[PDB]
Design a protein around this ligand. Structure first.
Ligand SMILES: Nc1ncnc2c1ncn2[C@@H]1O[C@H](COP(=O)(O)OP(=O)(O)O)[C@@H](O)[C@H]1O
Ligand code: BEF
Ligand SMILES: [Mg+2]
Length: 426
RNA sequence: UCAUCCA
């Protein structure tokens, strides 16, 4: 007794249709694409015009001076445009956002118009407020010359304007889970029209803190929806759990199937004692801040250490500001915007800034504290070397971090990085 | 630990 709908909007372009099985295999080999699943996977595309996006989307793309789709776009576009459930795993900074947003636009464009009272057609869930806001900004860039309406549903901002967006009608909603659950409970929106569901940073969204919130939301979406999950990491602990939210899905990987970092990052690991970190940070910042572009993110383990380090650095004269979950949302957005503009070129952060954020010209990531997992390491260092850029990561590793040493060495080896002998000694 | 509704 539910309304019928379509989700397959894909026809192979003739240039893709006429690829031989050998040419398709060589395309996947050269782009390091692996596909797994029960149904035959569509061939990868290799040019944007193979996707038959609307002309206004092509104009924004051709603006960006992208010369070709990234590997995850090459395989993700035709899978998503074909209406398939999918998990897309690809390196940080490799274009996963447009891999799900552009097929969302195509999906929306083929659905019946929104009538007053209708909820969103596309829902994208993200683990942090700033990431949700960033994704909405990308969506609006590509739907600017269309009649597509978006909103960002997230905590720490006034409800009024969000409620008015939902009441007027939005085709795409980007949300963090808490505020969305709030609005769903009180009937400020509903998911009766949601047929395209994206979990960005999906392995984070399926962790112990988020999974009950995600389950509460996704339980309200029709099971014949299309579900698309994306991340740079896919640890064993979330894999069978993810299948609770997927039907007849295909998994795409780019690069190594094990945990791996973006190979455009120069990864440096300094094995030292906890007491040596502050002196070594000052030495490092003295070298970094004498360079032309010096935009740097410094990651620490706790909100308290974030505050303490920022206070100490600002007193020593460094133009540093911090972002963490105990700051007000206006202060969080203000600090991130000053970092984006370069007015505050040093950002000190908890893991609130470890995933998804795409900031122009970050040249250095410093792990002042090694993170809680090697997956977090891969996301943190991926704040640099995004798109066709390189960058550097510098990590302080203490004997207290020993239990993480083996997994860190494997990541370094997979990325062809030089291994500090003091690290291998551990 | 860190995120994630405080109206
Ligand atoms: N085909 C492409 N070629 C080059 N750069 C791209 C392409 N697609 C997207 N980008 C850029 O790459 C950067 C990282 O994209 P993002 O979607 O944030 O990465 P991910 O989600 O994979 O970590 C963004 O600035 C985006 O504009
Ligand atoms: F993996 Be991208 F950094 F969101
Ligand atoms: Mg992303």
């Amino acid at each position: 007794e539910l309304p019928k709908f379509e989700k397959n909007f894909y026809v192979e372009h003739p240039e893709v249709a006429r690829l031989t099985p050998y040419e398709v295999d060589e395309l996947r080999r050269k782009k390091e694409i692996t596909v797994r699943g029960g149904d035959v996977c569509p061939k990868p595309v290799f040019a944007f015009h193979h996707a038959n996006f609307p002309q206004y989307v092509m104009d924004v793309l051709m603006d960006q001076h992208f010369t070709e789709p990234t590997p995850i776009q090459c395989q993700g576009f035709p899978l998503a445009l074909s209406g398939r459930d999918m998990v897309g795993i690809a390196q940080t900074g490799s274009g996963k956002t447009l891999a799900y947003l552009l097929p969302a636009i195509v999906h929306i464009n083929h659905q019946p118009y929104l009538e007053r009272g209708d909820g969103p057609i596309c829902l994208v869930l993200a683990p942090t407020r700033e990431l949700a806001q960033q994704v909405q900004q990308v969506a609006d860039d590509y739907g600017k010359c269309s009649r597509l309406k978006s909103t960002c549903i997230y905590g720490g901002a006034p409800k009024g304007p969000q409620i008015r967006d939902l009441e007027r009608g939005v085709e795409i909603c980007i949300a963090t889970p808490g505020r969305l659950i709030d609005f769903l409970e009180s009937g400020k929106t509903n998911l009766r029209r949601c047929t395209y569901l994206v979990l960005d940073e999906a392995d984070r969204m399926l962790d112990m803190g988020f999974e009950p919130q995600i389950r509460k939301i996704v339980d309200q979406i029709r099971p014949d929806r299309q579900t698309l999950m994306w991340s740079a990491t896919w640890p064993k602990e979330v894999r069978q759990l993810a299948e609770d939210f997927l039907r007849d899905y295909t998994q795409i990987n780019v690069g190594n199937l094990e945990l791996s970092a973006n190979h455009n990052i120069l990864q440096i690991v300094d094995v030292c004692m906890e007491s040596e970190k502050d002196h070594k940070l000052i030495q490092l910042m003295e070298e970094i801040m004498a360079e032309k572009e010096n935009k740097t993110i410094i990651f620490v383990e706790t909100k308290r250490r974030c505050d303490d380090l920022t206070r100490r650095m600002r007193r020593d004269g460094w133009p540093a500001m911090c972002i963490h979950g105990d700051k007000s949302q206006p202060e969080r957005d203000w600090v991130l915007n000053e970092f984006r503009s370069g007015k505050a070129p040093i950002l000190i952060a908890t893991d609130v800034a470890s995933r998804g954020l795409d900031v122009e010209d970050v040249k250095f990531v410093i792990n002042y504290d090694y993170p809680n997992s090697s997956e977090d390491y891969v996301h943190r260092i991926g704040r640099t070397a995004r798109s066709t850029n390189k960058g550097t990561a510098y990590t302080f590793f203490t004997p207290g971090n020993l239990k993480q040493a083996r997994e860190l060495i494997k990541v370094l080896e997979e990325a062809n990085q030089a291994i500090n002998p003091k690290l291998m000694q551990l």
